[PDB]
């Protein structure tokens, strides 16, 4: 996991999508904690999410990339497919489901950006955001814009 995570950190530093942030944290001994990254996803242009910089943590297990990272918005995000805890539910983020070791951190972050304006109402992760989306898309979009202004950098 460390060699792959260091390879992806090196790759991230040389080139990454504009507006995105992905940085390893520090271990209690001072070394870089490659298993825990503080990330940020900008809201996509031309969507109600624009202007916001949505912070999230990527937690990697010892066997990454055989296992997906756990992705969690901090603080919790209002989105039909983000659990109340902040954990992002994306099928590629489940080992037994669509995770593949060829998937990279850059692809995950780009995919979570896509998820922001493309929620899946068939299987929602939180009652709050989904209920608003289901009853009133005008109120749903206003709640999204208000949250984008709340998380503006």
């Amino acid at each position: 996991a460390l060699s792959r995570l260091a390879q992806e950190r090196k790759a991230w530093r040389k080139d990454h999508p504009f507006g995105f942030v992905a940085v390893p944290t520090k271990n209690p001994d001072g070394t870089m904690n490659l298993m825990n990254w503080e990330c940020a996803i900008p809201g996509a242009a031309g969507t109600p999410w624009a202007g916001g910089l949505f912070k999230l943590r990527m937690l990697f297990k010892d066997d990454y990339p055989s296992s997906p990272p756990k992705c969690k918005f901090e603080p919790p995000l209002f989105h039909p497919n983000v659990y109340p805890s902040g954990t992002v539910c994306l099928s590629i983020l489940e080992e037994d489901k669509d995770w593949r070791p060829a998937i990279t951190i850059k692809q995950i972050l780009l995919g979570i950006q896509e998820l922001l304006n493309e929620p899946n109402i068939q299987d929602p992760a939180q009652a709050e955001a989904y209920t608003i989306y289901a009853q009133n898309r005008v109120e749903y979009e206003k709640r999204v814009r208000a949250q984008a202004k709340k998380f503006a950098p």
């Binding site: 039909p80 497919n81 994306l90 099928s91 669509d98 995919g111 493309e118 899946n120 992760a125």
Partner: peptide, 6 residues
Amino acid sequence: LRLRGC
């Protein structure tokens, strides 16, 4: 990239 929320 089979991307769909869950």
